[PDB]
Amino acid sequence: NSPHSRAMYVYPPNVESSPELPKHIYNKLDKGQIIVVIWVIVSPNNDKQKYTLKINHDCVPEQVIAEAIRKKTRSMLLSSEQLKLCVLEYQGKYILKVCGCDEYFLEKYPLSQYKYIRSCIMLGRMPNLMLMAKESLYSQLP
Amino acid sequence: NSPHSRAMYVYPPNVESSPELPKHIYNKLDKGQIIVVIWVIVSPNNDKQKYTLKINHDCVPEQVIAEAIRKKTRSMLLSSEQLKLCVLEYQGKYILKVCGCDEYFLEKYPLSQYKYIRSCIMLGRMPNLMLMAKESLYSQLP
Ligand SMILES: *CCC(=O)N1CCn2nc(-c3nc(-c4ccc5c(cnn5C)c4)c4ccsc4c3-c3c(F)cc(F)cc3OCCOC)cc2[C@H]1C
């Protein structure tokens, strides 16, 4: 089986049955938008950097990856064609997970449909997420 | 004629000539096991939930239903008799099909002998399957 399949089997997504967000949960957001923190390892010294994003609650994990690139590329050092290539490149290179936990967001679902996010919203807690390279995920498989 | 007989005539299986898997295809599996995706409709609003299973390639469709039952009841501390009762009940209530396509797995064949499954194995792709209520299939017959 493909490494993508084995990651799905080992780390199955914890999504809700409906993508429709309950009204009492949606009202806890800022006009349906949720503030999340995105971590990443940027240096060989395992130094971690972070971005604080405000995104729609129904963003899929691949849209979170794209939104984090737009946050960084605000300071322009690349053309538009280079930027589009970088978004597609890193969308196929990185996956999203909960920081410090064995909870992953490998499948295309609205972020708020994942159970970890809903508990974060109901608890008034900020989702603490990490961008991990797909190859680093495939190497830790049994 | 019986409704099950009518379903076989209307939806005949697309199977390969031999149940023996060629070596170059078998070697694409993880020690003879295939990872499949099983969808199901859980709410009257047609909300779908899914399981990602790793099963023997020569499981018959009724064994796929049994493996999905063991997946859900894994934590429930059920006895063998309790588990068997649920397995027999849902084996007589649900059939297996390709999700979103008019391809069915109604007959006792090794799953890998079906042409859709074997091509999935050769592609390194997960079979995208759906569990449909038997009565819903018999109602759509001519
Ligand atoms: C084609 C893609 C490409 O070449 N690049 C250039 C490098 N790059 N880094 C990130 C990225 N950067 C940060 C970040 C924030 C703040 C920082 C530093 C360093 N010093 N400070 C103060 C780095 C970051 C923080 C969280 S996530 C992230 C990313 C980032 C991203 F937004 C989306 C991703 F898919 C991956 C990454 O990180 C990859 C690890 O570093 C290479 C984006 C890029 C892209 C545009």
Ligand SMILES: *CCC(=O)N1CCn2nc(-c3nc(-c4ccc5c(cnn5C)c4)c4ccsc4c3-c3c(F)cc(F)cc3OCCOC)cc2[C@H]1C
């Ligand atoms: C004696 C048998 C019996 O009473 N039950 C109880 C109900 N039941 N549901 C399933 C089943 N559940 C899921 C599933 C997975 C993840 C879920 C939800 C809801 N929320 N989350 C996060 C439901 C499921 C997903 C794919 S297949 C499946 C099944 C399932 C099965 F494994 C085998 C089948 F033959 C049928 C079904 O689903 C039938 C639809 O009813 C919900 C199993 C049972 C059994 C144990």
